[PDB]
Design a protein around this ligand. Structure first.
Ligand SMILES: *[C@H]1O[C@H](CO)[C@@H](O)[C@H](O)[C@@H]1O
Ligand SMILES: *[C@H]1O[C@H](CO)[C@@H](O)[C@H](O)[C@@H]1O
Ligand SMILES: [Zn+2]
Ligand SMILES: [Zn+2]
Ligand SMILES: [Zn+2]
Ligand SMILES: [Zn+2]
Length: 325
């Protein structure tokens, strides 16, 4: 068994949604390789919270996990909690009837006021799922032995639908060979260790660093020392507080950011680090690379992933990288 599903980005690629059949209802979930919970909007929510969102409707065979509960919080003061159900979930043709579904009956603003987003599908390691009293398996993990190969690949596109492959690699999605690196699951994430980086045509930095691959995150969050070195090559850039991070003229084209992985160069086009205007029709533009200060962890998000074909292989574990076709 294998399958592929299409993912379309919101506005300026701020969150990629993917159709997923949960129960009998079809929802549009956000695939996050940074978390391990699968939660959706439930009927138990306030009507004014439901508005703008498809809600989860149990199957006739589903079974409510009595006594269990789940609660999660993310990067910002963004929470969600609720009950747990054992229903059927279908993603790109791969089906399972023992997937745990986390129904939310209480959530934060960010979620409620994000019409269209109907919840999340976590693809990190199951060890960090938050269900209680017994943690549950992610979807991938749950269908792992139904897949021709125990892996999945992602191909995110800029301002265009990408794709999530389950259990197989589509050779038409990348050019040249796949380079593999050992994944560090120590914190429950798909971590890895780049050997260095390179700003524009500069000379690569032998000094490596530890990073996680988080599809659920829009930007590239690195250590301040690196950010500062980067924007030093962007004319007119400034640490505009009361705006989030660094900004510069939209007309400016920033240099590429290369991430060295063994002998492979994962080059993020400068064009993608010119994220978007701080305001409608604004003159200045927000950068794709900001500071990870406050998380203490380096994250390579959608901006980095928009140029790679990434393979998440449970065997090792390991991550594979290839220049997107
Ligand atoms: C309850 O839900 C299941 C899943 O869609 C169906 O197979 C059944 O016929 C009934 O609608
Ligand atoms: C950014 O653009 C300015 C243009 O004034 C240059 O002076 C600088 O070296 C960098 O290329
Ligand atoms: Zn198959
Ligand atoms: Zn929807
Ligand atoms: Zn995430
Ligand atoms: Zn370039």
């Amino acid at each position: 068994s294998k399958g592929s599903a299409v993912t379309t980005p919101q506005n300026n690629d701020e969150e990629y949604l993917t159709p997923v059949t949960v129960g009998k209802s079809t929802l549009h979930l956000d695939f996050d390789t940074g978390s391990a919970d699968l939660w959706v909007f439930s009927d138990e929510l306030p009507s004014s919270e439901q508005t703008g969102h498809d809600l989860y409707t149990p199957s006739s065979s589903a079974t409510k996990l009595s006594g269990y509960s789940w609660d999660i919080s993310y990067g910002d003061g963004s929470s969600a909690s609720g009950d747990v159900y054992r229903d059927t979930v279908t993603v790109g043709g791969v089906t399972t009837n023992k997937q745990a579904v986390e129904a939310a009956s209480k959530i934060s603003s960010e979620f409620v006021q994000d019409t269209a987003n109907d919840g999340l599908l976590g693809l990190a390691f199951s060890s960090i799922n938050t269900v209680q009293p017994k943690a549950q398996t992610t979807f991938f993990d749950t269908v792992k032995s139904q897949l021709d190969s125990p892996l999945f690949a992602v191909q995110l596109k800029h301002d265009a639908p990408g794709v999530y492959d389950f259990g197989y690699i589509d050779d038409s999605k990348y050019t040249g060979s796949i380079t593999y690196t050992d994944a560090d699951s120590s914190q429950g994430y798909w971590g890895f260790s780049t050997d260095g980086y390179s700003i524009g045509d500069g000379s690569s930095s032998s000094s490596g660093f530890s990073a996680i691959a988080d599809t659920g995150t829009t930007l590239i969050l690195l250590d301040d020392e690196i950010v500062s070195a980067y924007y030093e090559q962007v004319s007119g850039a400034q640490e505009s507080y009361e705006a989030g991070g660094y900004v510069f003229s939209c007309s400016t084209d920033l240099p590429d950011f290369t991430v060295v992985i063994g002998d492979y160069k994962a080059v993020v086009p400068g064009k993608y680090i010119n994220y978007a205007p701080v305001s409608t029709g604004s003159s200045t533009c927000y950068g794709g690379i900001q500071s990870n200060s406050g998380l203490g962890l380096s994250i390579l998000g959608d901006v980095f992933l928009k140029s790679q074909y990434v393979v998440f292989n449970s065997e090792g574990p390991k991550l594979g990288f290839a220049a997107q076709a």
